[PDB]
């Protein structure tokens, strides 16, 4: 698909057996998902945005379906107000910015 | 151009006579630039990201050249770690997300 940017670029994702809405975000290095339970070991991490830093749990090798496209990578879980699909997974579905 | 996302999508902008680097950010509604002096009156705005809220100054109808494309629109000025080009100006230069 080609997605215009008049509105937030939100898509449906499947992660950990649940359906969620998430933002396709070229400004995010990593993918950040609201608090949920995932399997495996995790390590703590601090990530910084506008307004300061938050603590998240880093999970590796997580499978995510993004608008029907399967991808695997690291997912950060923490108190974000919006689910964010970052560059580490956008590259895997072949996403590009065009102008 | 067509910009892949294996690296941060950084571009050169020109604003108020100065060259700066900025991130093309589909996850940002608005455009936010580090502290600088711009012409005209400003208005207050609160913006919220991952780490809380900050107060910024809103300037309207600012000329800005983004990777050689001219845009005229609203720019927010405040303590941001990186200069962010958001959807308000990405739509003016005709940017889309494709996969
Ligand atoms: C290592 O991995 C990461 C991954 C992500 C982040 S990140 O979330 O911190 N970030 C990184 C940028 C700032 C360098 C990704 C950016 O796309 C963010 C996404 C977003 C949208 C909505 C809510 C939270 C986060 N966007 C935003 O902050 O948008 C807000 C939205 C409301 C208004 C409109 C915008 C103009 O100013 C900002 C503060 C905004 O206020 C950092 C590190
Ligand atoms: Cl990854």
Among B86, B89, B85, which Cα is nearest to B11's? B85
Is B72 in the A-facing interface, judged by CB distances under 8 Å?
no
Distance CA A11, CA B46 (A): 26
Question: Which residue range(s) make up the domain with A49?
Answer: 1-99
Indicate which atom in ligand 1 lies nearest the CA of residue A25.
17
Distance CA B99, CA B97 (A): 7
Technique used:
X-ray
Among B33, B20, B25, which Cα is nearest to B9's? B25
Stretch 41-60 of chain A: residues touching chain B, C-beta under 8 Å: 47-54
Given A24, A84, A98, which is nearest B95 (Cβ)? A98
Which CATH number do you get for residue B97? 2.40.70.10
Q: How far is B22 from chain A (nearest CA, A)?
A: 10
Sign of CA dihedral A97, B2, B5, B8: negative
Residue with the two structure tokens 């990777």: B67
Among A90, A8, A70, A65, which Cα is nearest to B98's? A90
The count of structural domains within chain B is: 1
């Amino acid at each position: 698909p080609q997605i215009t940017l008049w509105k937030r670029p939100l898509v449906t994702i499947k992660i950990g057996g649940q359906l969620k809405e998430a933002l396709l975000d070229t400004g995010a290095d990593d993918t950040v998902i609201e608090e949920m339970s995932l399997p495996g070991r995790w390590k703590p991490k601090m990530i910084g945005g506008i307004g300061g830093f938050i603590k998240v749990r880093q999970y590796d090798q997580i499978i995510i379906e993004i608008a029907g496209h399967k991808a695997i990578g690291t997912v950060l879980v923490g108190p974000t107000p919006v689910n964010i699909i970052g560059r580490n997974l956008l590259t895997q579905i072949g996403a590009t910015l065009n102008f």
